[PDB]
Ligand binder design. Structure first.
Ligand SMILES: Nc1ncnc2c1ncn2[C@@H]1O[C@H](COP(=O)(O)OP(=O)(O)NP(=O)(O)O)[C@@H](O)[C@H]1O
Ligand SMILES: [Mg+2]
Lengths: 104, 108, 32
Protein backbone atom coordinates (compact mmCIF):
# COMPACT_ATOMS: atom_id res chain seq x y z
CA UNK A 1 0.00 0.00 0.00
CA UNK A 2 1.08 3.63 0.04
CA UNK A 3 0.90 6.84 2.19
CA UNK A 4 -2.09 7.82 4.34
CA UNK A 5 -4.81 10.49 3.99
CA UNK A 6 -2.29 13.35 4.07
CA UNK A 7 -0.22 12.05 7.02
CA UNK A 8 3.50 12.32 7.16
CA UNK A 9 5.52 9.11 6.64
CA UNK A 10 7.34 9.59 9.84
CA UNK A 11 3.97 9.26 11.76
CA UNK A 12 3.33 5.86 10.07
CA UNK A 13 5.75 3.98 12.25
CA UNK A 14 6.91 0.32 12.17
CA UNK A 15 4.55 -1.98 13.95
CA UNK A 16 2.04 0.71 14.15
CA UNK A 17 -1.54 -0.51 13.52
CA UNK A 18 -3.31 1.26 10.70
CA UNK A 19 -6.77 1.23 9.21
CA UNK A 20 -6.97 0.32 5.64
CA UNK A 21 -9.73 0.27 2.96
CA UNK A 22 -12.18 -2.73 2.79
CA UNK A 23 -11.42 -3.37 -0.90
CA UNK A 24 -9.28 -0.47 -2.18
CA UNK A 25 -6.53 -1.44 0.34
CA UNK A 26 -4.87 1.84 1.30
CA UNK A 27 -3.96 3.69 4.52
CA UNK A 28 -6.63 6.11 5.79
CA UNK A 29 -6.19 6.75 9.51
CA UNK A 30 -3.36 5.78 11.92
CA UNK A 31 -4.60 3.64 14.87
CA UNK A 32 -2.86 3.17 18.28
CA UNK A 33 0.38 1.04 17.93
CA UNK A 34 -1.08 -2.17 19.53
CA UNK A 35 -2.48 -1.96 23.03
CA UNK A 36 0.65 -1.65 24.83
CA UNK A 37 -0.61 1.86 26.08
CA UNK A 38 -2.70 1.83 29.25
CA UNK A 39 -2.15 -1.83 30.03
CA UNK A 40 1.46 -1.16 30.79
CA UNK A 41 0.68 1.79 33.06
CA UNK A 42 -1.10 -0.54 35.56
CA UNK A 43 2.15 -2.67 35.69
CA UNK A 44 4.45 0.31 36.48
CA UNK A 45 5.06 0.60 40.33
CA UNK A 46 6.96 3.85 41.49
CA UNK A 47 9.79 4.08 44.04
CA UNK A 48 8.44 2.00 46.95
CA UNK A 49 9.42 2.71 50.60
CA UNK A 50 11.25 -0.70 50.98
CA UNK A 51 14.58 -0.21 52.70
CA UNK A 52 17.28 -2.57 53.98
CA UNK A 53 15.57 -2.60 57.46
CA UNK A 54 12.69 -4.48 55.75
CA UNK A 55 15.15 -6.84 54.10
CA UNK A 56 15.75 -9.78 56.45
CA UNK A 57 19.50 -10.22 56.61
CA UNK A 58 22.21 -8.91 54.41
CA UNK A 59 24.51 -10.98 52.15
CA UNK A 60 27.40 -10.45 49.70
CA UNK A 61 24.97 -10.07 46.71
CA UNK A 62 23.69 -6.83 48.30
CA UNK A 63 27.26 -5.59 48.69
CA UNK A 64 27.72 -6.33 44.93
CA UNK A 65 24.47 -4.40 44.18
CA UNK A 66 25.77 -1.32 46.01
CA UNK A 67 28.88 -0.94 43.88
CA UNK A 68 27.12 -1.06 40.54
CA UNK A 69 24.20 1.23 41.22
CA UNK A 70 25.35 3.62 44.01
CA UNK A 71 28.96 4.36 43.23
CA UNK A 72 28.96 5.71 39.66
CA UNK A 73 25.93 7.86 40.43
CA UNK A 74 27.20 9.63 43.59
CA UNK A 75 30.63 10.20 41.99
CA UNK A 76 31.49 9.22 38.37
CA UNK A 77 34.87 11.03 38.98
CA UNK A 78 36.10 7.83 40.82
CA UNK A 79 35.30 5.67 37.88
CA UNK A 80 37.22 7.92 35.49
CA UNK A 81 40.36 7.96 37.63
CA UNK A 82 40.47 4.23 37.85
CA UNK A 83 39.91 4.09 34.17
CA UNK A 84 37.59 0.98 34.55
CA UNK A 85 34.28 0.83 32.80
CA UNK A 86 31.46 2.13 35.03
CA UNK A 87 29.02 -0.67 35.93
CA UNK A 88 25.41 0.14 35.04
CA UNK A 89 24.03 -3.18 33.78
CA UNK A 90 23.18 -6.04 36.18
CA UNK A 91 21.54 -9.50 35.87
CA UNK A 92 19.95 -10.77 39.11
CA UNK A 93 19.23 -14.57 39.35
CA UNK A 94 18.35 -17.47 41.57
CA UNK A 95 15.43 -19.44 43.03
CA UNK A 96 12.09 -17.49 43.29
CA UNK A 97 10.92 -15.95 46.68
CA UNK A 98 14.57 -15.15 47.62
CA UNK A 99 13.71 -11.48 47.76
CA UNK A 100 15.41 -10.38 44.40
CA UNK A 101 12.77 -7.66 43.88
CA UNK A 102 12.99 -6.49 47.56
CA UNK A 103 16.61 -5.49 47.08
CA UNK A 104 16.06 -3.78 43.77
CA UNK B 1 35.57 -26.79 17.63
CA UNK B 2 37.12 -27.77 20.83
CA UNK B 3 39.00 -31.15 20.33
CA UNK B 4 39.21 -33.41 17.28
CA UNK B 5 38.82 -36.57 19.27
CA UNK B 6 35.16 -35.52 19.62
CA UNK B 7 34.82 -34.86 15.88
CA UNK B 8 33.76 -37.73 13.61
CA UNK B 9 36.48 -39.53 11.48
CA UNK B 10 35.13 -38.88 7.90
CA UNK B 11 35.21 -35.10 7.74
CA UNK B 12 38.68 -34.94 9.45
CA UNK B 13 40.57 -36.01 6.45
CA UNK B 14 43.90 -34.22 5.59
CA UNK B 15 43.54 -31.79 2.65
CA UNK B 16 39.75 -31.60 3.20
CA UNK B 17 39.69 -28.82 5.71
CA UNK B 18 43.21 -27.79 4.61
CA UNK B 19 45.64 -27.40 7.61
CA UNK B 20 44.82 -28.45 11.00
CA UNK B 21 46.18 -26.12 13.50
CA UNK B 22 46.45 -26.83 17.15
CA UNK B 23 46.59 -24.09 19.73
CA UNK B 24 49.45 -24.60 22.32
CA UNK B 25 48.81 -23.12 25.81
CA UNK B 26 50.28 -19.84 27.23
CA UNK B 27 53.93 -20.54 28.27
CA UNK B 28 54.82 -17.76 30.64
CA UNK B 29 55.72 -15.41 27.77
CA UNK B 30 52.48 -15.05 26.13
CA UNK B 31 50.74 -14.71 29.61
CA UNK B 32 52.58 -11.49 30.46
CA UNK B 33 51.43 -9.98 27.17
CA UNK B 34 47.93 -11.07 27.54
CA UNK B 35 47.62 -9.42 30.83
CA UNK B 36 49.45 -6.26 29.71
CA UNK B 37 46.96 -5.53 26.92
CA UNK B 38 43.95 -6.05 29.27
CA UNK B 39 45.36 -3.56 31.89
CA UNK B 40 46.01 -0.89 29.20
CA UNK B 41 42.36 0.12 29.40
CA UNK B 42 42.42 0.64 33.14
CA UNK B 43 45.01 3.01 34.68
CA UNK B 44 48.62 1.86 34.33
CA UNK B 45 50.96 2.02 37.39
CA UNK B 46 54.44 0.56 38.14
CA UNK B 47 53.00 -0.90 41.42
CA UNK B 48 51.65 -3.61 39.19
CA UNK B 49 54.23 -6.24 38.24
CA UNK B 50 53.23 -8.21 35.16
CA UNK B 51 56.07 -10.66 35.27
CA UNK B 52 55.20 -11.73 38.83
CA UNK B 53 51.66 -12.36 37.83
CA UNK B 54 52.80 -14.55 34.86
CA UNK B 55 54.52 -16.76 37.30
CA UNK B 56 51.49 -17.10 39.63
CA UNK B 57 49.10 -18.06 36.87
CA UNK B 58 49.63 -21.66 35.70
CA UNK B 59 47.28 -23.40 33.26
CA UNK B 60 45.03 -20.46 32.63
CA UNK B 61 43.67 -19.57 29.12
CA UNK B 62 43.29 -16.09 27.58
CA UNK B 63 39.73 -15.90 28.90
CA UNK B 64 40.66 -16.76 32.48
CA UNK B 65 43.51 -14.10 32.53
CA UNK B 66 41.08 -11.56 31.32
CA UNK B 67 38.79 -12.38 34.19
CA UNK B 68 41.75 -11.91 36.72
CA UNK B 69 42.25 -8.24 35.56
CA UNK B 70 38.44 -7.42 35.50
CA UNK B 71 38.17 -8.75 39.07
CA UNK B 72 41.05 -6.55 40.16
CA UNK B 73 39.11 -3.32 39.31
CA UNK B 74 36.08 -4.30 41.33
CA UNK B 75 38.39 -4.79 44.38
CA UNK B 76 40.18 -1.37 43.87
CA UNK B 77 36.84 0.36 43.62
CA UNK B 78 35.63 -1.47 46.76
CA UNK B 79 38.87 -0.34 48.66
CA UNK B 80 38.18 3.08 47.14
CA UNK B 81 41.79 3.67 45.89
CA UNK B 82 42.28 6.04 43.03
CA UNK B 83 44.58 3.60 41.43
CA UNK B 84 44.53 -0.23 41.44
CA UNK B 85 47.28 -1.95 43.39
CA UNK B 86 49.26 -5.07 42.46
CA UNK B 87 47.85 -6.48 45.60
CA UNK B 88 44.29 -6.52 44.13
CA UNK B 89 45.35 -8.67 41.02
CA UNK B 90 46.62 -11.39 43.35
CA UNK B 91 43.27 -11.41 45.12
CA UNK B 92 41.44 -11.68 41.74
CA UNK B 93 43.52 -14.72 40.93
CA UNK B 94 42.17 -16.73 43.83
CA UNK B 95 38.55 -15.50 43.20
CA UNK B 96 38.59 -16.58 39.48
CA UNK B 97 39.93 -19.91 40.90
CA UNK B 98 37.34 -22.50 41.53
CA UNK B 99 38.41 -23.04 45.11
CA UNK B 100 37.36 -20.60 47.81
CA UNK B 101 39.74 -17.73 48.74
CA UNK B 102 42.40 -18.08 51.53
CA UNK B 103 40.75 -18.83 54.87
CA UNK B 104 41.74 -20.15 58.35
CA UNK B 105 42.10 -23.99 58.79
CA UNK B 106 39.11 -26.09 59.63
CA UNK B 107 39.70 -29.58 58.18
CA UNK B 108 43.12 -29.50 56.69
CA UNK C 1 7.48 11.79 -33.85
CA UNK C 2 4.70 9.39 -35.07
CA UNK C 3 6.29 6.25 -33.62
CA UNK C 4 6.99 7.93 -30.19
CA UNK C 5 3.34 8.84 -29.61
CA UNK C 6 2.26 5.25 -30.06
CA UNK C 7 4.65 4.36 -27.12
CA UNK C 8 3.05 7.11 -24.97
CA UNK C 9 -0.46 5.60 -25.14
CA UNK C 10 0.72 1.97 -24.40
CA UNK C 11 2.70 3.35 -21.39
CA UNK C 12 -0.46 4.96 -19.79
CA UNK C 13 -2.42 1.74 -19.78
CA UNK C 14 0.60 0.01 -18.06
CA UNK C 15 0.49 2.97 -15.58
CA UNK C 16 -3.19 2.15 -14.49
CA UNK C 17 -2.41 -1.46 -13.55
CA UNK C 18 0.85 -0.62 -11.70
CA UNK C 19 -1.15 1.78 -9.42
CA UNK C 20 -1.11 0.69 -5.85
CA UNK C 21 -2.43 -1.50 -4.07
CA UNK C 22 -1.59 -4.80 -5.83
CA UNK C 23 -1.47 -8.36 -4.83
CA UNK C 24 1.97 -9.55 -3.69
CA UNK C 25 2.89 -13.02 -4.60
CA UNK C 26 5.88 -15.29 -5.11
CA UNK C 27 6.92 -17.18 -8.23
CA UNK C 28 7.32 -20.81 -7.43
CA UNK C 29 9.31 -21.52 -10.61
CA UNK C 30 9.48 -20.41 -14.27
CA UNK C 31 8.84 -23.32 -16.61
CA UNK C 32 9.82 -21.27 -19.63
N1 LIG D 1 15.05 -10.42 52.98
C1 LIG D 1 13.64 -10.28 53.21
N2 LIG D 1 12.96 -9.47 54.13
C2 LIG D 1 11.60 -9.63 54.22
N3 LIG D 1 10.71 -10.45 53.62
C3 LIG D 1 11.39 -11.16 52.70
C4 LIG D 1 12.79 -11.13 52.49
N4 LIG D 1 13.15 -11.97 51.47
C5 LIG D 1 12.05 -12.55 51.09
N5 LIG D 1 10.91 -12.04 51.74
C6 LIG D 1 9.55 -12.43 51.39
O1 LIG D 1 9.41 -13.38 50.37
C7 LIG D 1 8.74 -12.83 49.26
C8 LIG D 1 9.16 -13.46 47.86
O2 LIG D 1 10.30 -12.69 47.43
P1 LIG D 1 9.90 -11.74 46.22
O3 LIG D 1 10.66 -10.52 46.38
O4 LIG D 1 8.44 -11.60 46.04
O5 LIG D 1 10.54 -12.54 44.85
P2 LIG D 1 11.88 -12.88 43.72
O6 LIG D 1 12.89 -13.67 44.49
O7 LIG D 1 12.35 -11.52 43.03
N6 LIG D 1 11.14 -13.93 42.57
P3 LIG D 1 10.88 -14.28 40.95
O8 LIG D 1 11.20 -13.00 40.17
O9 LIG D 1 9.41 -14.56 40.94
O10 LIG D 1 11.68 -15.37 40.50
C9 LIG D 1 9.04 -11.26 49.51
O11 LIG D 1 8.22 -10.37 48.76
C10 LIG D 1 8.78 -11.16 50.95
O12 LIG D 1 7.45 -11.43 51.37
MG1 LIG E 1 11.28 -10.91 40.86
Amino acid sequence: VGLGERVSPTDIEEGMRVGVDRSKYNIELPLPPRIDPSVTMMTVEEKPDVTYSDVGGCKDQIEKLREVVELPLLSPERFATLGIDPPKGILLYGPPGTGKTLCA
Amino acid sequence: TNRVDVLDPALLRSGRLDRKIEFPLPSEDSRAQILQIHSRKMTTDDDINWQELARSTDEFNGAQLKAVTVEAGMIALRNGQSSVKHEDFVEGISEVQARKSKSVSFYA
Amino acid sequence: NVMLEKIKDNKEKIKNNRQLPYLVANVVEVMD
